[PDB]
Symmetry: none
């Protein structure tokens, strides 16, 4: 274990190396968004004299508890501060020009951090000879409060501050990744859930253009979470009322403690109230609209979902294990609205078991599968190289009710199955290591060559409209063609 010192444009940073892999933690990519910089676009960090310590993770953005995953896991509450704009880098050596993988974590734009141990980049760096960056972006009100109507044009883009932080992190990578052994021209961005929604937004955002050449969207897309300017303004008003800040009062906005913003967001109620906004500046149009027009004709995309995405939410709501029909229909109607009737009839026929079990694929399709396929189809029509996957390995935890649930693929992709708390999520079956390797190397290959094919996997055709080939990650990996044919038709017919 030894220190390794690297010099960024802002100053020197002190990391650590075991010889095989070096890691720098808590590197500032922007000036702290506190005081006047709170609710403002990110600013470059002030240069420093001396050797800055990069052996410790920076604090996470201020967040609510969100223990769903953390209760099954043993994970501790994350150390938090409004001063959170930090990234962490894993590289084999500062010498070289490797492909770069930049990770955008999920958590519904409200929770999470780049510091989470499941996102540790050591294995990717060691196995793939690549540089891995994980980062923090402003979450919650500090990140995504649309204050344009309330506080005027001084706060333009406030609905997308979290995305502007991600872009600032991408700009830092282009300018300084060379000092850490990375090639700024070979950058892949990848994320899960809200992280994949952020990737979907970044494909549409004009400021992010040229900062990345390839993108991976895991259980999320541009269809997931983006809000219209009108809807975002209404959410902002409700939060301000919970916050006690009247529109136009600059002081009260800055004077409010960061925790109070988190409490006000939580008091609005469950769901995804805050997300990226189609404001016209940062996000000029809907991400799906930009995709259809060929905004990402040059970008290569790997997009996918897990087989039983929505099953994870059966932990906070056990009705999905039941056959009660009033509660199930109410839950379905919340997402699909007027189409609830026919689709419930379609999904009830297929499968076996309780009604909730048969209705869970409906929710997965509405939330996750739909955005994935639209992303893949739009890219295919404009001719960009695209690959599609489905993650089918199931965790046996809690009686096997989760199946291949939301977020299960994270430890497989990062090969962090042994990291703290992961096996509580995935279970301890020895077969999981081989599945992780198949997925891990595919992510490596895509980042390096733009093609996820490697010798472990069978022949993985590019996703196209005629075949709709989709790689299935299982104990025995296989390629399935048009696996969502039936549902995709009925959703069109309903």
């Amino acid at each position: 274990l030894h220190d390794v010192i690297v010099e960024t444009r802002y100053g020197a940073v002190r990391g650590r190396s075991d010889g095989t892999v070096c890691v720098w933690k808590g590197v500032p990519f922007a000036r702290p968004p506190v005081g006047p910089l709170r609710f403002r676009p990110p600013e470059p960090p002030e240069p420093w004299s001396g050797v800055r310590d990069a052996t410790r993770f920076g604090p996470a953005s201020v967040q609510p508890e969100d223990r769903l995953i953390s209760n099954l896991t043993g994970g501790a509450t994350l150390p938090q501060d409004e001063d959170c704009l930090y990234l962490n880098i894993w590289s084999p050596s500062p010498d070289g020009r490797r492909p770069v993988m930049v990770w955008i974590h999920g958590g519904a734009y409200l929770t999470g951090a780049g510091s989470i141990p499941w996102y540790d980049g050591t294995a990717l760096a060691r196995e793939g000879d690549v540089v891995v960056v994980t980062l923090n972006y402003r979450l919650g009100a500090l990140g995504f409060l649309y204050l344009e109507d309330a506080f005027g044009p001084e706060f333009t883009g406030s609905g997308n501050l979290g995305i502007l932080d991600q872009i600032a992190a991408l700009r830092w990578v282009r300018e300084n990744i060379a000092a850490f052994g990375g090639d700024p021209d070979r950058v892949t961005i990848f994320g899960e859930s809200a992280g994949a929604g952020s990737v979907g937004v970044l494909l549409a955002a004009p400021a992010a253009r040229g900062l990345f050449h390839r993108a991976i969207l895991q259980s999320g897309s541009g269809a997931l979470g983006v809000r219209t300017a009108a809807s975002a303004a209404r959410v902002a008003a409700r939060v301000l009322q919970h916050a006690g800040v009247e529109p136009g009062d600059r002081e009260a906005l800055r004077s409010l403690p960061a925790r109070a913003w988190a409490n006000a967001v939580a008091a609005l109620g469950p769901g995804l109230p805050l997300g990226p906004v189609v404001d016209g500046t940062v996000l000029p149009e809907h991400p799906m609209a930009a995709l259809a027009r060929g905004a990402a004709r040059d970008v290569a995309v790997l997009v996918g979902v897990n087989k039983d995405e929505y099953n994870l939410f059966a932990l906070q709501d056990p009705a999905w294990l039941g056959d009660d029909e009033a509660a199930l229909r109410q839950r379905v109607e919340a997402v699909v609205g007027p189409a609830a009737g026919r689709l419930i009839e379609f999904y009830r026929s297929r499968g076996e078991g309780s009604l909730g079990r048969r209705l869970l694929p409906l929710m997965s399709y509405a939330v996750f599968v739909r955005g994935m396929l639209a992303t893949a189809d739009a890219q295919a029509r404009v001719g960009a190289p695209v690959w599609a996957y489905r993650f089918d390995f199931e965790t046996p935890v809690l009686g096997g009710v989760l199946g291949a649930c939301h977020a299960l693929e994270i430890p497989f992709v990062f090969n962090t199955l042994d990291r703290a708390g992961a096996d509580r999520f995935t279970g301890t079956a020895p077969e999981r290591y081989a599945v992780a390797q198949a997925m891990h190397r595919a992510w490596i290959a895509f980042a390096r060559e733009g093609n996820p094919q490697h010798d472990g996997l069978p022949e993985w055709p590019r996703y196209d409209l005629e075949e709709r080939a989709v790689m299935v990650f299982a104990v025995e990996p296989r390629v399935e063609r048009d696996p969502w044919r039936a549902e995709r038709e009925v959703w069109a017919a309903a």
Copy 2:
């Protein structure tokens, strides 16, 4: 002399004690207390704590009825009890090192017992074998195994196996934290007796437990022991709720009821095995022996066995089994075996000595214990797993030798706890028991360490197979007998 040893789990620091030779941590929490809203819910990791937690005292036992069958022979002091019972105990030579781990699941018919019972003390095993021993508590009785799916709906999915989910959770804790106590998480052996061995049989079947252990020992129990169908469990669940005074669907009364009232509600059902693991479709997808035959545990290595005269212990509860011929003795048999008892009673009647009830005790032993043992042994042999089989023949002289090699006698031999309080009271004071105890003790140590129970004290112990059906017999002179239940095997096959 005794000095403190402070070790840090993922959740916090715990303070144990060491005499220099062995360290012990008692009352280490592996889950949040299953109280209030957490009652009737699966275990969750415990809240992390700052500071140093005391691990010098045992945690409270799960709320349970009194068992003075076992207590009258033993000192049997009433166990301190609380619904907040999810605790485990660790015995290790040193926090430094990476030894094999032995995890004990205590018996007691899914209603009683605790990891804190002194016959389960792991000091001798750790000292002799250089292993880490963990004893644990799981939720017992209604709080553990009430099947509330039909009554209260899908919020209580898996409620029939909450005790099993606690055992899984304890193993997850061991995998997570046993390194800090000197254990190797990749070399974990699970062993249990009676309902504990029945729990082991379920763990071989349960997919959530897969990978949490590499070897298993089943003493006087199997996967067949106490398992219920969902239907059978819901009917018992209905009976329990009525005695408790809880109407179906009344969630407040469910949580409001004191834990003692649940224990009494189970007791009001009458004697027997009313609660056990349930084939609910989730936690346990199929019957354990069905999973065994399908190769669910083909990777796991197993040491399985029974005592010679298992059921004789339960004859203390009912005189009829020692008494002369009765219609009731046939009824007691038919309740376990239904139609087949007609033919079985006549075959057992001719065999053996003494009263008809005494001659019928081997019938009950085979039905309850020997059958599942041989089925478990046959299943692993067919799927290719390494299996060894044993029979415990040492006889206790108490009560005139009616007990013989009865149920639960082999435990202090396995743990080398013969001088624990009251043990010689159960086993007798013959000086030969020390050699038999060492014989079983070292074989258990050997199986946990190397995966093969053969050691120099014992004669050559052949692996159990379908051809030879080799069974090591633990006696004053240990010997290997081949197909010792051959005669009975055919007759049981001949009728149901």
Copy 3:
């Protein structure tokens, strides 16, 4: 490296262990002497919930930078804060009841810390199966300003606060050292220079009467640095005027920044103005007087000096190399006053080389050898077991002018020759490792058995008035009897 958690009476502390040795750094043995507690005796530290981090050294006492050794060896500047009352522990295992060695660092009561790497206790712990404690005490004005006359009886004992800090640490040791594998009844205190002067004061101080069983005094004694209440009050007056704090102004005394005390002390000009005071409370009598009364008849003592103690001060002043006679007479005249004339010619005649070279043993005797011999003679008369040593290994650095200078023996005793900067002081000759081992194990044996004898050394008789046997630590160690016989008479005559 893995964490080891121990519970003190005040709370838990988290240390580090390589398997062979555990170390805890920055353990607070007293409440921070800040604010109202400044210029006051130490108080027990506040208990804490949780596990306190003991992986990093606590800050050192506020001190001026003294680059005598540090310029030669390259040492960096100590991190400093007024809250400095911390100690550091090295033990094989928290299980056990080993002898305890408590180190009091030198630095003329003005500089130093227990955290200096030459004081690392790992080697002592590993080799000797002992627990080693190094500590910080309040230095400078915060430690030894005699403000009783200035600020009245509220500030009784202010002249000896640094000594009270050492006592509190020894009291802490008695209470808590059992948790770290030490036996509080087998405690040896050892120090060098001002640290050995503190040991000399501790033998006299009645509060310390039970806190230790044995003492080692390296190049220092109770004769070294102790001040009368009268003279200390006069030193206090000069500092207060440099400070700008008028006597009887409590706010100014607490208002002044801690650094200003260091600057005011340094502005008092060259040499050391602060030391322990015979105030009547903490120190009732002169340390040498107490020894003569048999106050330490119970304690076993190991006392010694280096052969060329004063040669170190030559690095600051070139005249010692020089043959100028007016300058040397004046410097000698500063120490010995009216007896300078006769002594100068006794020393001028003996030896060879420059006049400065011939006059350096004169200064060595006055400052160091005198207090050592008086301490040994007092203990011998009262019957306490006492051993005497002389360190003769010479450093070849800077043309060999230093010889066996002051403080050279520190890395030898601690077996810390490879530690950062030590080799610049001692040189890199391969012979030093054996001399260190001989000294190191002898210190171990004394702490363990009360006898410094070990197989490496020749037969080492206890120091007595008849034979006056002194063990000489050299490449070939030997016993010399009455080696200062000639000097003893001339200084007496």
Copy 4:
């Protein structure tokens, strides 16, 4: 293909450069700048710095006069110079590892030279031998070797040997920090040429340097080379002070004088070797050869040697060596060997070929170089230290071959710097030079590595002993010659001058 490498010394972080194969750090400070109050004082460790200090450029050389003969032979321009000169340079394959270390002390008559000379570039040694190479600067001329003890008193004790104390300081820095650069501090070899080898000879004698190195290479130099008695140095010091305009005891003028003026004051003394290490009693307690004979360096292993025609280089300064006059030649011989000049002139006049002066050049070569070499080699053999001896016979064709195997010719061969700027002007363009260079290059590497200079390229090289007096001869065909100076050894012994 060139990237930054940041390594941390005890004093701070330094940024070098790497092509992948070898990393280089230039201009790393090993002592506080010896300016102002630190002038005429021993070296002190450098002040710690925060941040990353640039180590991509060479530090300035010690203030020195111009060396015209070296300049005429070699293209390099006058060196950048400053009184703040205490810098060293490191070449290593990688900061990871624990390689043997070679520390180079440059020659130049204690007045000129720097570690930055491109012929001293350690890249080739690092890549081929898997070793770490350090070149350093030490104070030269008056700033380095003025014996000020008598003039200004004991404040300047050891001032006659400040350059040597700088060399010790660099070795202390190596012991301290070389681990961060991929070197092993316990396997350190010191090597030098000319006055650099004279410094090595003194370092064997100096007790302060003991243990800082385990092996030494002495090329065209020995402990006898340039060392002065305290008396002679005080006399030279007075002349230097007079030219400088500094009266004894005037501390103001001593510190006030510009560093260039010191260089001029030494130059005003005239040609020769006016300044060298001084037997002052402290830094150097005894004469280096006296310490050697008593076994002061019995633990150190030594490779010592000379070039075949050492003194011939200096004939490009003074043409009398090409002339035939007896009066001029006799004066020059008398300066070195004194009263024994007549016996040797007659010995040497018969021997050899050419003019009398050309035949008298071996006399000077033996007195200045060969004699001290054999005395050093003989001393180590007697005390039992392992010693190997060499003679460099490769000849330069420049100036009609009058130079032959002259002084300093072997340097680019040992460093394998035949390709660096200007070298071909000195050595010539014969394709054979590469093989002889490899023979020496690899032999030096082996000695630093294993303590034995034997490698497969060279024939079997026996250890030097008093009986056989085995000497490795570096030629186009490398060979071993036994007692090659036997004839001269006996005559010089008879002569009372050896």
